[PDB]
Structure 1
């Protein structure tokens, strides 16, 4: 009990210290970064209204960890969802597992009734290839259309920001300098909502799959985390934020994603009911053990969508490094801090 109680007390203190000195983003930086996101969003709305009122798009809106207060270390990225207007009876969703490619968590969007509803029935028909709405082509078209009407230098002067598009292949990303030597990256994310299926143009790592839309998970995942914590004032999000801060701070663990780390916590929250403040140290080591377990198994099921392996996009190369890094730190987790 002595040695173990000891290790746990030390770790708890170091975990709590690590959160405040590394994971937590300064209020000033956080306020100004979000204000910059909101400024750009408002300005784009006015732009879309004046210049592209006939484009079948709903208004762009902000989404992401920075909006959910789950971002860590620095306020450096947020998404602007670009939601396409697609008529129900002209389009449908095909699950990736119901496809030859066989890719869970991704979808084909098929143009329906190509005869009865001829080409031109939707603006987005121009982005249809082989009968399917291409995420890539949609993204290229949106970039073209906006860039051919937008005036970032002018908007920058207005808001007193340095605003510039990043060079490809991150061309739907906006580099926003909202204060001296601090930048916010706003990436424009085309989205489709058909029925209750919400999809986003976040390409599969493999270009051979660039015609597939990704099933959007973050919102439902974020909501279940918050509800789990709100009911018992648990430290699920604190633990998550610490894990994110570590991976974002450690080059060798950079391959892990916020979504992957979130589902590790959601799986543990399924196993462990008690997330009272004093259990943080124990839940942290448990999260690290689970990480290793999933990595060795090569699969991490999505807690909300179990057919989906969230590690499916990691190469053997990266799996190896993650396991390696975590196997080098087993004896002394505090090293990760």
Structure 2
């Protein structure tokens, strides 16, 4: 039965071994601690809060292997010197992306904020911030030595990413993610795929999506997360489905969760099939709205050939969904 194949596939393929998960998290934590001592000693005058770990691995949503985690690099912006402008209120009209504008330049001249050194054309550039960060922070750390202290080999790559070998044949990729918060709005420097939109900060969706997902299950107590992890593992293991993202898949689950309230254990097979059908529907329309930010098309960064290959692969699977479940 499909139900059995899904249950066993989660344990056999999607679930990360406990030892591997613990060692990957410990390595992330040790490295996070090292940046903290580094910032304290070397950058006392840069308005940046401490870096901290974030992501699927931490949220127990990572699958197959523990291979990635984010280190958020939280810039401090003066609330009276900066504002954010929603991409849909601009002429570029890019929902889910924001400009960060330098305010009051007549009264507060350049130098009134540390981050003025990353302003281009009156906007805090996410590209220059990212560059600034690597040159001032990332390139200033003796990774080989720190790697020697712990028993990891650490290798800077994708220049804002670290490869950390925490086991034989197991590596964790840590990416540094510059971030700003203005009022209630959290923005990250994760560039749009299109370089013409490269002064645009990305609205941070993942923490709220993960929160809502955890909330939905914690009261059920349902198999949404279980279904999501199976989907993530499938896409990660199937080269033609690799373009789908953890966030896209979470949103497919979130939209399905608004149309179906029963996620009891035995419903996993049906929901799984519904998730496949929802994905096809979104792919054909070329539109997958963010469940929490309806203006935002999460498929807006996929290319025609990608949407086509994705659509085709799922179609070919409809009659025999179990073929996606290779383990």
Query: Is the CA contact 1:51–1:149 (under 8 Å) kept in the aligned structure 2?
Result: no
Q: How far off is 1:177 after superposition? A: 0.7
CA distance in 1, matches of 2:122, 2:163: 35
From 119, 133, 137, give the equivalent of 2:124: 133
Q: How far off is 1:147 after superposition? A: 3.8
Query: Is the CA contact 2:118–2:128 (under 8 Å) kept in the aligned structure 1?
Result: yes
Q: How far off is 1:157 after superposition? A: 1.1
Query: Is the CA contact 1:12–1:281 (under 8 Å) kept in the aligned structure 2?
Result: yes
Of 147-156 and 58-67, deviating more is 147-156
Per the alignment, in what secondary structure is the counterpart of residue 137 of structure 2?
helix
Alignment of 1:267-278 (within 5 A): 267-278=255-266
CA distance in 2, matches of 1:324, 1:268: 21
Partner of 1:194: 182
Q: How far off is 1:149 after superposition? A: 2.9
Partner of 1:80: 71
CA distance in 1, matches of 2:48, 2:153: 27
CA distance in 2, matches of 1:147, 1:322: 36
Query: Is the CA contact 2:84–2:98 (under 8 Å) kept in the aligned structure 1?
Result: yes
Partner of 2:25: 34
Partner of 1:3: none
Per the alignment, in what secondary structure is the counterpart of residue 148 of structure 1?
helix
Deviations 1:93-151 (A, max 9, x none): 00001111110000000001112111111111011001001111000001000145311
CA distance in 2, matches of 1:180, 1:252: 28
CA distance in 2, matches of 1:233, 1:188: 34
Deviations 1:27-56 (A, max 9, x none): 111000000000000110011001101111
Alignment of 1:1-337 (within 5 A): 10-166=1-157, 170-337=158-325
Query: Is the CA contact 2:32–2:51 (under 8 Å) kept in the aligned structure 1?
Result: yes
CA distance in 2, matches of 1:180, 1:330: 38
Report the TM-score, using the length of structure 2 for normalisation. 0.98
CA 1:17/1:93 → structure 2, altered by over 3 Å: closer, same or farther?
same
Q: How far off is 1:196 after superposition? A: 0.3
CA distance in 2, matches of 1:217, 1:146: 26
Query: Is the CA contact 2:138–2:160 (under 8 Å) kept in the aligned structure 1?
Result: no
- Hey, which bits of structure 1, 4+ residues long, moved more than 2 A? none
CA RMSD of aligned residues (A): 0.7
Mark the runs of 5 or more structure 1 residues left unpaired by the alignment: 1-9
Query: Is the CA contact 2:79–2:182 (under 8 Å) kept in the aligned structure 1?
Result: yes
CA distance in 2, matches of 1:47, 1:147: 10
CA 1:304/1:122 → structure 2, altered by over 3 Å: closer, same or farther?
same
Of 146-155 and 300-309, deviating more is 146-155
CA distance in 2, matches of 1:280, 1:326: 18
Q: How far off is 1:179 after superposition? A: 1.4
Q: How far off is 1:180 after superposition? A: 1.4
Deviations 1:60-98 (A, max 9, x none): 000000000000000000000000000001000000011
Of 151-160 and 212-221, deviating more is 151-160
Query: Is the CA contact 1:72–1:244 (under 8 Å) kept in the aligned structure 2?
Result: yes
Aligned residues: 325
Per the alignment, in what secondary structure is the counterpart of residue 264 of structure 1?
helix
Mark the runs of 5 or more structure 2 residues left unpaired by the alignment: none
CA distance in 2, matches of 1:329, 1:273: 25
CA distance in 1, matches of 2:276, 2:226: 14
Deviations 1:285-336 (A, max 9, x none): 0000000000001101111110100000001110000000001111100011
Deviations 1:222-278 (A, max 9, x none): 111111101011000000000000000000000100000000000010000110000
